[PDB]
Design a protein around this ligand. Structure first.
Ligand SMILES: [Zn+2]
Ligand SMILES: [Zn+2]
Ligand SMILES: [Zn+2]
Ligand SMILES: [Zn+2]
Ligand SMILES: [Zn+2]
Ligand SMILES: [Zn+2]
Ligand SMILES: [Zn+2]
Ligand SMILES: [Zn+2]
Ligand SMILES: [Zn+2]
Ligand SMILES: [Zn+2]
Ligand SMILES: [Zn+2]
Ligand SMILES: [Zn+2]
Ligand SMILES: [Zn+2]
Ligand SMILES: [Zn+2]
Ligand SMILES: [Zn+2]
Lengths: 504, 9
């Protein structure tokens, strides 16, 4: 039944930065990595962990060690055999004092990684942490030691390997990256699970959602996440079908607490209270999506079904009062709030090509103007904005942004204060009581006990409003009407693309 | 799999 052949052209509004899971922080990079490389495990469309490169994984010492046997006969794109050496190399990099990436959180539970045979590795942990089995194993792309094994770890991120000479063992091989235009990949004929059916996959960079929709209509791209507002338009396009479901994601406003304006919890609570988030969803998403009050996706087994968290529902006069109570009032008749010789004025950034977020930024500007807060909007190209938000820059006052969430629910990576300096706590949030809860939660094995203790963490994050949570988005995936073998995955848009085929 | 900044939605 399955038929070999064809070319998929995937439209993307964001350009990748590099292809290396130890350094990338963004979904566009991750999309390409998942085609180029292999991983010990893979989380499937039901969010279950499955073996991929691993032949077997045995949990030892109550979760303080993992003995991993690797499939034999797996080749890198250069024809060389993947072995334990490569796995030991790759997972040892973030344990080096010279590691300069933002992914330290994923590996900090590791004490060591040891070769036990040509195809066998033992992982040893310093303490129990479910992030290792459930996140590190499926997130860590295996790199070739015979290429990178002697590059100084301080210089690994800059290496040309990560941009235009990547060599992996994944289902597609790198052909070309025409900067600002596209990345072209070709089926790996020697892929360990069998060659892809598709001959090529092209990731076409179009930082303008309207332009991408027009290209989809014309047949210049044939796979795209259509904005909800364009659904009724796109469903009429020739030769296409659309698969729709909830994304493992939320969209938010990040308030940078490096900025004086956003250090006070009461001010952050006021900003949320000033925003008509239901109207945002109605207006900007045409009602397609739900307002978010919790830093977790409804898809998660950890999502709290029966929790009453503070919501900070829209109330313009209450926001005014809260800001006055916090010391802000217009003291110069200019219409904008004033405190200690400073005016409440800042820049709200978001990413070029996401018309929904661009619109949200304008709506936030208008709604906050009504309570005397001045916002300048700024649209920035995706790769640059990723660079700006990350350490060592944190170069934003506020941003409209999203997370593609981890499939293993743990807020430590994003909200623990230890993750500010070199991790994903871009907004400089610190609640010492929340820190303790998140740290202590790692040792809780039973899921019911874990979820129960997480109710307290959600309460603290909700109360503190380090973000204004905006909504849980839906994906609307347009694809060729004859595309077979596709399964909807809420996190990986191109999940198992090597198994998709075009019926002819 | 771990958290990533997402461009879409
Ligand atoms: Zn970096
Ligand atoms: Zn030892
Ligand atoms: Zn040992
Ligand atoms: Zn040997
Ligand atoms: Zn080798
Ligand atoms: Zn150097
Ligand atoms: Zn061939
Ligand atoms: Zn346009
Ligand atoms: Zn929809
Ligand atoms: Zn609704
Ligand atoms: Zn003023
Ligand atoms: Zn635009
Ligand atoms: Zn618009
Ligand atoms: Zn307390
Ligand atoms: Zn994607």
């Amino acid at each position: 039944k399955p038929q070999q052949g064809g070319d998929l052209v995937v439209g993307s509004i964001g350009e990748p930065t590099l292809f290396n899971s130890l350094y990338s922080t963004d979904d566009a990079s991750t999309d390409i990595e998942n085609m180029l490389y292999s991983f010990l495990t893979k989380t499937d469309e039901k969010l279950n962990v499955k073996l991929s490169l691993a032949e077997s994984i045995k949990e030892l010492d109550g979760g303080l060690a993992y003995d991993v046997k690797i499939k034999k006969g797996v080749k890198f794109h250069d024809g060389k055999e993947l072995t334990a050496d490569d796995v030991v190399f790759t997972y040892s990099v973030p344990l080096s004092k010279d590691y300069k990436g933002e992914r330290g959180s994923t590996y900090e539970m590791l004490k060591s990684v040891e070769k036990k045979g040509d195809y066998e590795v033992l992982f040893k942990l310093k303490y129990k942490d479910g992030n290792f089995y459930n996140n590190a194993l499926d997130s860590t792309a295996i790199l070739p030691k015979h290429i990178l094994g002697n590059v100084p770890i301080a210089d690994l991120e800059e290496n040309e390997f990560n941009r235009k000479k990547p060599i992996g063992s994944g289902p597609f091989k790198f052909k070309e990256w025409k900067q600002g235009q596209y990345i072209k990949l070709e089926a790996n004929d020697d892929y360990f699970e069998g060659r892809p059916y598709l001959d090529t996959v092209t990731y076409k960079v179009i930082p303008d959602a309207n332009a991408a929709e027009a290209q989809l209509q014309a047949g210049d791209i044939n796979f795209f996440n259509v904005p909800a507002t364009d659904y009724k338009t796109a469903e009429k396009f020739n030769n296409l079908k659309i698969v729709t479901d909830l994304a493992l994601s939320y969209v938010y406003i990040g308030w940078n607490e490096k900025n004086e304006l956003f250090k006070d919890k009461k001010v952050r609570q006021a900003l949320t209270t000033a925003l008509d988030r239901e109207s945002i969803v109605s207006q900007v998403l045409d009602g397609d999506g739900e307002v978010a009050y919790i830093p977790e996706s409804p898809l998660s087994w950890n999502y709290p079904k029966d929790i009453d968290v503070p919501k900070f529902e829209y109330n313009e006069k209450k926001a005014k009062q809260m800001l006055a109570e916090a010391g802000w009032k217009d003291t110069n008749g200019d219409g904008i709030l004033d405190k200690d010789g400073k005016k409440f004025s800042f820049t709200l950034k978001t990413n070029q090509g996401n018309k929904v977020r661009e619109d949200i930024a304008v709506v936030v500007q208008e709604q906050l103007k009504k309570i005397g807060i001045e916002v300048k909007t700024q649209i920035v190209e995706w790769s640059a904005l990723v660079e700006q938000m990350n350490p060592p820059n944190w170069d934003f006052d506020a941003m409209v942004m999203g997370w593609s969430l981890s499939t293993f629910p743990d807020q430590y990576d994003i909200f623990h204060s230890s993750q500010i300096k070199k991790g994903l706590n871009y907004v400089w949030y610190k609640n010492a009581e929340a820190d303790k809860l998140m740290k202590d939660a790692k040792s809780i094995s039973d899921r019911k006990q874990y979820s129960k203790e997480y109710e307290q963490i959600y309460q603290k994050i909700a109360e503190d409003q380090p973000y204004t949570f905006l909504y849980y988005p839906n994906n609307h995936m347009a694809m060729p009407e004859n595309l077979e073998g596709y399964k909807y995955h809420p996190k990986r848009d191109l999940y198992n693309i090597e198994k998709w085929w075009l019926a002819k | 799999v771990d958290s990533k900044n997402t461009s879409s939605w």
